[PDB]
Design a protein around this ligand. Structure first.
Ligand SMILES: Nc1ncnc2c1ncn2[C@@H]1O[C@H](COP(=O)(O)OP(=O)(O)OP(O)(O)=S)[C@@H](O)[C@H]1O
Ligand SMILES: Nc1ncnc2c1ncn2[C@@H]1O[C@H](COP(=O)(O)OP(=O)(O)OP(O)(O)=S)[C@@H](O)[C@H]1O
Ligand SMILES: Nc1ncnc2c1ncn2[C@@H]1O[C@H](COP(=O)(O)OP(=O)(O)OP(O)(O)=S)[C@@H](O)[C@H]1O
Ligand SMILES: Nc1ncnc2c1ncn2[C@@H]1O[C@H](COP(=O)(O)OP(=O)(O)O)[C@@H](O)[C@H]1O
Ligand SMILES: [Mg+2]
Ligand SMILES: [Mg+2]
Ligand SMILES: [Mg+2]
Lengths: 327, 340, 350, 343, 319
DNA sequence: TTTTTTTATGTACTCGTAGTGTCT
DNA sequence: AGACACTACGAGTACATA
């Protein structure tokens, strides 16, 4: 049953009408498939934007419920070498369909992990067999694809999901589930997603499990922040104010109590302070240079471990020494 | 059978003897285990990614969850634990992991469905995912995305940055918090009571203070102090000094001597005292930590001096985190902080 | 390799009753090493311009094609000594343009330039050329060409640069910077390129960092010290030193695994500490006690399960003021003969 | 010799009575013993104390050990052959004898000994002594991270090292940490008096022994070996002004420091590179070379505080570089060039 | 949706050498060669999407007439092209007897010749030298440096260059006239701008815009095709103020879904191929970009790292 | 004017013991 | 019934890598 799948998998779009966020790409793809002129597609975008869902719904619209048989779907989980290309892809492109009449579809999902020899062998398979089959390449990084292979497909850039699309999907989920969400909680949820539907769905499931009730109550910002362990804007601005204004000992005590009372992480506080100070209008850019350099160095050091107290004191001292030049 | 396991647990180190067996024994990591308990009644366990400092209980939490889910019978047939002591290249991920994910779930017995929920999926846990190469990690993407109906993936790591962004997006992130004195004093007192550890007032809270968010190291230090107190047989209580002497902490007088040498003195006497101090084996990480605590918490230095001391201690810790020579780094730090 | 027809032909070159002529384009190759001293080597070099000029005049008047002798020199120097490519160029361009004297030769040379990879010694010369990094030479030999120079052979270019970057006379010294400062900056960038190369050829196979290793290891240290070549371009000696150190590490590992039963120390802990005393225990009694100190040395080497080969290998680790390469020759041959004779006589418990 | 006079039990130690009492405490109940990590200066006597602790956990047969040969196959046709020092109660592994293939040996051998149960006709577990855990790369340490916890009833690790800097935090947490401080000059002189009384050495003055201590920097392995070495030059009778025999590499490093402080040029940098090559080719680690060269450069009285500060700063920088690199000469020559530019 | 139509890149693929709008010199050379015969061994190199494969295909077709099926041996990178293939099949084709007109020869087309192994390339030398009177070889590659010098010495070298805006505009106008598509001057200019001398990419973007919006306008072209990636990176690196470069990186690159790895790689490539600044400044910028890339590859790829890279670049430019 | 370097997956070549259908 | 050409799956050896 579908009631056992996680929310990321349970709410996977099955038709092109359930893929929000991408409107310029979805409409053009629908027109491609309606007029018949469907070229080789290259869906390039960040993770969780809806490329795999889009191509699956497209193949479903093209072939019907018989998608899993009339389409050759290869991914990084499967062995994709030059011999794999030579045999499988060429034999799939050269022959005809077994169940119906129509062009074939080769979905090379996550093709950014393919070998250079495989792409060099495939670039002439795409150009030779182009009247009976098609190629759709999904990618997160366009630098791992050879320019020859990159020039044979129509490139569609999947932009990060905007506010309206994620809010629409959240409303759809809140209709599908017996769940209520606060407005400010919804805004905070949009803020910690960066256009990733997977993260939104996962944390929504986690906060629904966190409610500890039969779901007669509403999900507030406190529930979200305690679920994802993210710092609140209130504590963020309090720590920033204590660093900028209060003394060294006072700022140290404030940072310690804020990061120990809620169990917050230093990397999350660093990211939040960076996001907040981005709107700060300052004097000569030397302070910004010092701030960015020292904060990136501290982040790279945190990414490898060490003493958390030493790194917190380093963050405080770096911010103070950077703002000491803005006078 | 059961009695043999009880005796083996009773004759094991306190780290493994008091390993949490249920989702209730975990004390401080409540936000994650609340969701884990609420999903135990449901059947929609998502792909999970545990990350946090070492010794916070990630492996213990996932083991207790798998136990409470499957029972001690299906625990050995519906799990796939892949640790860092095994090969985890592209070949392994493509053959073994994918074959296990494509497998159907094992049929539960009659006794399993009576006491345990027995969800219709299995769990493939990957401990220490930091060592997994980026290509072997990207290979897991569709493996975990298409076979989610029959298997569930649980990644465990310390540095969440070592895992690629798509895998971190596919899994729900559970951040395990550092176990300081406040949220682990209950567990430490329970461990001390179960072992009749006669300690003083401010010992346990001090132990975790030396642990810096690590309950395993705290339990090990408690076991060492208990052994050292039982060998003597004096019947007294363990003191904070007896704990800090075996934990690698530099005494306060030796630290005051270092502060006096840095405050007053030139390169020569500082170098001589550093050479003499390195004879007595102390970990430079603990020395840097104590110096940072002393310099930051003291209300006797200027803010301009405090920013510089913080940056210098940060640089020294970052250089020590790469396996450098402790003597050279400590001498360089003390000299740099001696020059105003 | 070890198996192949190369060695078979090399051995055939020793026993034959019929003339055996061999033709190859690259002589100084490792696979061509067995042919070093077995066959008479003849080198065909760059042909002279006069004979090629006469041949071109002939094939031009024969093919109804106009050509002046002033262009043949440029054709040859762009072709870099290949009459075949010159003939193909004439046959290809003659079908449309029947005359090429001084007007269309620019595009002809720019379109038929021989893009050949330089030897690992010519890359060292071009990298350390001070004119290339000048303000005029920079916009002629661009940075892309400098990186392609390294990419011609990315296995020796960093080593060749690190070998002879401090053996030149710099001509790009900034005002207020001495030669030592530029050499120190080049060495710092060499260390950074070393870190990058270690990150490249390690786990995770970060080969996409190869262009970066191009700049840090080769381009930047050369630019910092570019100029004239003072002496000769010395080949990188790091390879031979690494081979010697690896062999010595193998020998020291054998010695440590032989005497672990008594020392209970590490390889480095035995090399730094035990050998300065093992030398005076084994070798020193020979210089002061003649040939009657043999039993003591045998007993000492037995107490730690040493061997004759181990004894000979131990004395090769010491450097500086303690070198035994002459001390062993100073020992009377009678003492050494008695020692090696007693070695193959007394039984030794492994 | 340092081997003829070495303690074999806990009651035979002659320094660090607090550490001996702690070891007795830890070996009182031997079956409820966690993993241990002995750290401290090189040459303090931690490898002897580990064997003395095993002699208290088991019978005296722990010292009767044998060296066997074990073979392993990598991902390719390459084969590795390494010698294991095994005993009827424990085994000793030193992965510092190979390159990046230590993780395979670690995982395979440790899983084998974990699944393997001890034999009879000689307690319940079999100890493993990981010698020089600093050479273990992060991959092998990560592989051992879970092996330490999965099999805790049969395999107890006693990891011997000289500095916990390259040891990862999980491994540090997974075992007790025992520091072995280097013995003071008094205890070293006391041991030297006993060994020269047993070896029949003639001393006109006792203070020379103290000087040996002041020449060993707490190291007993260096002190005893240097005493036996200088006893061979003075013909079993040490004088009141007997010279201190320094190792050849130390004298070479001192001469290199002299060449650095006297001349600062590129022609001298070539000779410095040649000396560094000669030192590296004769089985001398580059970290020790850098440490000793920096400490010798700081001892030069011709320089001032401004020079010594920059020297130690460049030394730490290039120490990090060498710890992050593999071509050791590429960092050593850079450090030497930076020092030349500083002076 | 039962059947699809051929794309305009394949449908309007040139079948005669006159329809090629590439380099006029080499095209006229190949035309004269096919008209007179005696086609020599050739190696055609260039960039993707400029008319290299179509050029040699049209040459072979117009040179062989109806005997194309039995006189042309086409081998791509998709087929096995090892030493065994060169030894057996290529040699059997070169030795194969075929009665051709007294001005033609058998042609062996080898697409993507820069991917053949060294053994096959070495074995092909005598194969093409011993049968050079009845078999001719035409290689089509992107990098002439990947082909060994002995092979290049026995053939002509044709280096195809980028297609100027005039040629691509003429070809697009011809395609529009043959398709009757409503367009606009700004739309065609935007297509040429986003093509970057790539004729195939230009035709593909044109067909996409036509089938997605109907009218070829700059608005629709920019809506369906984003601005070129290297140009925005160049504008970001060449910014005079740190705030301008930070705003560019935030809005144009980071807010549009460009990964950090792609951003740092494009920055490295632009700084390498830059010519506005001196060599030393470019070297320091490449050093900083590589220092940032070393952190991006370790999984620390975020916006803060790119911001710090831009700050360090501006500090370097701050004299 | 010249020799070497740890490892990690993909690619290509080679000999090669082996498993089975066929002919003196 | 059996011998031996044909053959195709497997261990070993290198060779690159933007
Ligand atoms: N535009 C969208 N509309 C609705 N749900 C979406 C959308 N994009 C993503 N999702 C959700 O996120 C899940 C994963 O989407 P995918 O298409 O697999 O992500 P992706 O774009 O392929 O990126 P990858 O797989 O990490 S490279 C889907 O099953 C949906 O539940
Ligand atoms: N939250 C906790 N509650 C109780 N005991 C805990 C907790 N966390 C850790 N421990 C103790 O520490 C031991 C180690 O637990 P682990 O789960 O292995 O730690 P960890 O998070 O896996 O650290 P690693 O493996 O180095 S990332 C357990 O067996 C417990 O004895
Ligand atoms: N000069 C041209 N005139 C007309 N159409 C052209 C021209 N060049 C390219 N095209 C179009 O581009 C398509 C593919 O061109 P190709 O010749 O395959 O590209 P290429 O130059 O060979 O580069 P590759 O194949 O990627 S290495 C052709 O089918 C034409 O539709
Ligand atoms: N307590 C002690 N009393 C006397 N000698 C000791 C003592 N501890 C160690 N030693 C000496 O140290 C030598 C071994 O040193 P070792 O333990 O290998 O150094 P490390 O501590 O670096 O492993 C032995 O020869 C032994 O004589
Ligand atoms: Mg996908
Ligand atoms: Mg764990
Ligand atoms: Mg082509």
């Amino acid at each position: 049953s579908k009631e056992n799948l996680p929310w990321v998998e349970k709410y996977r779009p099955e038709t092109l009408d359930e893929v929000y966020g991408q409107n310029e790409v979805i409409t053009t793809v629908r027109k491609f498939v309606d007029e018949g002129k469907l070229p080789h597609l290259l869906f390039y975008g960040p993770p969780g934007t809806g490329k795999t869902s889009t191509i699956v719904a497209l193949a479903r619209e093209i072939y019907g419920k018989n998608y899993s048989n009339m389409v050759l779907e290869l991914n990084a989980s499967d062995d994709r070498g030059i011999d794999v290309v030579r045999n499988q892809i060429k034999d799939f492109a050269s022959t005809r369909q077994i169940f119906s009449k129509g062009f074939k579809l080769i979905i090379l999902d996550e093709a950014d992990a393919m070998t250079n020899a495989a792409q060099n062998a495939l670039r002439r398979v795409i150009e030779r067999y182009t009247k009976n089959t098609r190629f759709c390449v999904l990618a997160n990084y366009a630098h791992k694809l050879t320019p020859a292979l990159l020039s044979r497909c129509t490139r569609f850039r999947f932009q990060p999901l905007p506010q309206e699309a994620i809010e629409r999907r959240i409303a759809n989920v809140l209709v599908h589930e017996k769940l209520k969400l606060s407005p400010n909680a919804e805004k905070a949820l949009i803020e910690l997603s960066n256009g990733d539907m997977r993260r939104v769905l996962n944390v929504l499931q986690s906060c629904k499990a966190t409610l500890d009730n039969p779901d007669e109550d509403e999900i507030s910002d406190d529930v979200i922040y305690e679920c994802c362990g993210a710092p609140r804007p209130s504590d963020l601005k309090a720590v920033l104010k204590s660093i900028l204004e209060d003394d060294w000992g006072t700022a140290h005590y404030t940072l310690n109590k804020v990061r120990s009372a809620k169990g917050l992480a230093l990397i999350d506080l660093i990211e939040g302070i960076v996001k907040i100070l981005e709107d700060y209008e300052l004097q000569n850019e030397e302070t910004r240079v010092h701030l960015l350099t020292k904060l990136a160095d501290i982040e790279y050091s945190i990414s490898k471990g060490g003493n958390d107290q030493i790194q917190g004191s380093a963050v405080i001292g770096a911010i103070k020494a950077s703002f000491e030049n803005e006078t | 059978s059961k009695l043999a396991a009880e005796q083996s647990l009773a004759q094991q180190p306190w780290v493994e003897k008091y390993r949490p067996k249920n989702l209730d024994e975990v004390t401080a990591q409540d936000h994650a285990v609340t969701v884990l308990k609420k999903t135990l009644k449901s059947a929609n366990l998502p792909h999970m990614l545990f990350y946090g400092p070492p010794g916070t209980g990630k492996t213990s939490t996932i083991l207790a969850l798998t136990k409470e889910l499957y029972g001690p019978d299906l625990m050995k047939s519906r799990i796939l634990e892949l640790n860092a002591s095994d090969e985890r290249g592209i070949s392994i991920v493509r053959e073994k992991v994918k074959n296990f994910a494509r497998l159907t779930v094992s049929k539960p017995s009659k006794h399993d469905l009576e006491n345990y929920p027995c969800p219709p999926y299995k769990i493939i846990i990957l401990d220490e995912a930091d060592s997994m190469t980026a290509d072997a990690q990207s290979a897991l993407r569709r493996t975990m995305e298409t076979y989610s109906g029959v298997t569930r993936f649980c990644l465990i790591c310390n540095y969440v940055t070592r895992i690629i962004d798509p895998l971190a997006s596919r899994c729900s992130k559970f951040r395990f918090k550092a176990l300081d004195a406040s949220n682990a004093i209950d567990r430490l007192r329970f461990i001390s009571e179960q072992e009749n550890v006669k300690c003083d007032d401010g010992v346990l809270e001090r132990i975790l203070d030396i642990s810096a968010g690590d309950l395993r190291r705290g339990i090990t230090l408690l076991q060492s102090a208990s052994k050292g107190a039982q060998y003597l047989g004096d019947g007294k209580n363990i003191t904070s000094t007896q704990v800090e002497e075996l934990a690698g902490v530099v005494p306060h007088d030796i630290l005051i001597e270092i502060v006096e040498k840095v405050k007053s003195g030139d390169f020569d006497e500082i170098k001589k005292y550093v050479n003499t101090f390195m004879k007595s084996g102390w970990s430079a990480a603990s020395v840097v930590n104590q110096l940072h605590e002393y310099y930051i918490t003291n209300d006797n230095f200027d803010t301009n001096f405090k920013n510089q001391i913080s940056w210098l201690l940060f640089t020294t810790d970052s250089r020590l985190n790469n396996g450098t020579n402790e003597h050279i780094q400590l001498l360089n730090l003390l000299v740099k902080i001696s020059q105003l | 390799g070890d198996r192949g027809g190369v060695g078979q032909l090399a051995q055939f070159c020793r026993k034959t009753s019929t003339p055996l002529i061999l033709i190859c384009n690259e002589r100084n190759l490792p696979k061509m090493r067995p042919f070093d001293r077995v066959c008479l080597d003849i080198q065909f070099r760059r042909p002279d311009a006069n004979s090629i000029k006469s041949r071109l005049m002939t094939i031009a008047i024969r093919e109804k094609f106009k050509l002046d002798p002033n262009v043949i020199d440029r054709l040859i120097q762009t072709t870099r000594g290949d009459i075949r490519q010159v003939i193909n160029l004439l046959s290809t361009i003659s079908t449309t343009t029947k005359t090429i004297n001084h007007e269309n030769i620019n595009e002809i040379s720019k379109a038929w330039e021989k893009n050949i990879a330089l030897k690992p010694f010519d890359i060292a010369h071009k990298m350390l050329d001070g004119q290339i990094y000048s303000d005029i030479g920079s916009r002629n030999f661009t940075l892309n060409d400098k990186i392609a120079l390294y990419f011609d052979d990315f296995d020796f270019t960093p080593l060749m640069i690190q070998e002879n970057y401090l053996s030149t006379r710099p001509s790009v010294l900034k005002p207020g910077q001495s030669h030592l400062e530029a050499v120190a900056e080049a060495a710092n960038c060499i260390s950074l390129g070393d870190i990058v190369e270690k990150k490249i050829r390690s786990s995770e196979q970060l080969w996409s960092l190869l262009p970066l290793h191009a700049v840090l290891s080769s381009v930047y240290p050369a630019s910092k010290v570019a100029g004239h070549m003072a002496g000769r371009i010395n080949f990188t000696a790091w390879l031979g030193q690494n081979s010697k150190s690896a062999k010595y590490y193998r020998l020291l590992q054998e010695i440590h695994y032989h005497t672990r039963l008594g020392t209970s120390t590490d390889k480095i802990g035995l090399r730094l500490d035990y050998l300065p005393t093992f030398r005076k225990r084994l070798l020193d009694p020979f210089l002061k006690q003649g040939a009657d100190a043999i039993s003591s040395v045998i007993e000492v080497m037995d107490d730690y399960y040493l061997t004759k080969e181990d004894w000979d290998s131990i004395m090769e680790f010491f450097v500086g003021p303690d070198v035994t390469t002459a001390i062993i020759k100073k020992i009377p041959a009678t003492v050494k003969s008695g020692f090696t004779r007693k070695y193959n006589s007394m039984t030794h418990p492994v | 010799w340092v081997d003829k006079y070495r303690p074999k039990s806990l009651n035979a130690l002659s320094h660090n009575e607090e550490l001996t009492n702690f070891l007795k405490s830890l070996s009182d109940q031997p079956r409820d013993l966690p993993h241990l990590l002995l750290y401290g200066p090189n040459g303090t006597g931690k490898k002897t104390r580990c064997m003395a602790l095993l002699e208290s956990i088991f019978g005296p047969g722990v010292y009767r050990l044998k060296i066997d040969v074990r073979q392993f196959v990598t991902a390719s046709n390459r084969k590795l052959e390494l010698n294991v020092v095994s005993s009827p109660y424990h085994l000793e592994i030193t992965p510092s004898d190979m390159g990046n293939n230590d993780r395979i040996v670690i995982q395979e051998l440790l899983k084998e000994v974990a699944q393997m149960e001890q034999v009879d006709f000689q307690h319940r577990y079999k100890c493993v002594i990981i010698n020089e855990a600093n050479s273990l790369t992060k991959d092998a340490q990560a592989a051992l991270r879970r092996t330490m916890e999965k099999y805790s009833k049969n395999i107890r690790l006693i990891m011997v090292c000289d500095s916990m800097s390259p040891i990862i935090a999980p491994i540090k947490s997974r075992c007790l940490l025992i520091r072995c401080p280097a013995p003071s000059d008094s205890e070293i002189s006391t041991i030297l008096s006993d060994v020269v009384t047993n070896e029949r050495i003639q001393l006109e003055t006792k203070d020379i022994l103290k000087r040996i201590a002041q020449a060993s920097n707490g190291n007993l392995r260096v002190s005893l070996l240097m005493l036996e070495s200088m006893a061979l030059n003075n013909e079993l009778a040490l004088k009141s002004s007997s010279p201190i025999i320094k190792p050849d590499w130390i004298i070479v490093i001192h001469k290199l420091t002299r060449k650095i402080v006297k001349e600062r040029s590129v022609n001298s940098l070539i000779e410095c590179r040649a000396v560094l090559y000669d030192l590296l080719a004769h089985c001398i680690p580059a970290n020790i070379i850098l440490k000793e060269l920096t400490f010798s450069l700081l001892d030069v009285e011709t320089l001032n505080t401004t020079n010594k500060s920059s020297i130690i700063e460049y030394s730490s920088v290039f120490d990090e570089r060498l710890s992050l690199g593999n071509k050791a000469i590429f960092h050593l020559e850079g450090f030497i060039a930076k020092v030349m530019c500083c002076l | 949706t039962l059947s699809l139509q051929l794309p305009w890149v394949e449908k309007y693929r040139p079948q005669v050498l006159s329809d090629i709008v590439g380099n006029k010199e080499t095209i006229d050379r190949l035309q004269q060669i096919a008209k007179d015969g005696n086609m020599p061994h050739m190696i055609i190199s260039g960039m993707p999407g400029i008319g290299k494969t179509t050029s040699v295909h049209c040459l072979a077709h117009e040179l062989l007439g109806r005997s194309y099926a039995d006189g042309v041996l086409e081998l791509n990178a998709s087929d096995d092209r090892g030493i065994d293939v060169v030894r057996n099949q290529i040699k059997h084709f070169a030795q194969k007897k075929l009665h051709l007109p007294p001005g033609k020869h058998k042609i062996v087309i080898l697409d993507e010749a820069d991917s053949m192994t060294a053994g096959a390339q070495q074995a092909l030398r005598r194969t093409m030298e011993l049968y050079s009177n009845s078999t001719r070889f035409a290689f089509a590659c992107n990098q002439s440096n990947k082909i060994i010098e002995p092979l290049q010495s026995r053939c002509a070298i044709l280096r195809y260059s980028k297609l100027s805006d005039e040629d691509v505009l003429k070809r697009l106008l011809q395609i529009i006239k043959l398709e009757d598509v409503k367009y606009t001057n700004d739309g065609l200019e935007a297509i040429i701008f986003t093509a970057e001398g790539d004729m195939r990419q230009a035709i593909n973007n044109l067909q996409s815009t036509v089938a997605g919006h109907g009218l070829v306008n700059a608005d629709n072209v920019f809506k369906i095709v984003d601005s070129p990636h290297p140009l925005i990176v160049k504008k970001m690196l060449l910014a005079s103020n740190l705030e301008d470069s930070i705003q560019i990186l935030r809005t144009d690159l980071w807010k549009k879904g460009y990964s950090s790895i792609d951003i740092v790689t494009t920055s490295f490539r632009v700084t390498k191929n830059l010519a506005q600044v001196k060599e030393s400044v470019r070297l320091e910028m490449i050093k900083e970009i590589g220092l940032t890339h070393m952190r991006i590859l370790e999984g620390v790829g975020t916006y803060l790292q790119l911001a710090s890279m831009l700050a360090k670049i501006h500090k370097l430019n701050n004299k």
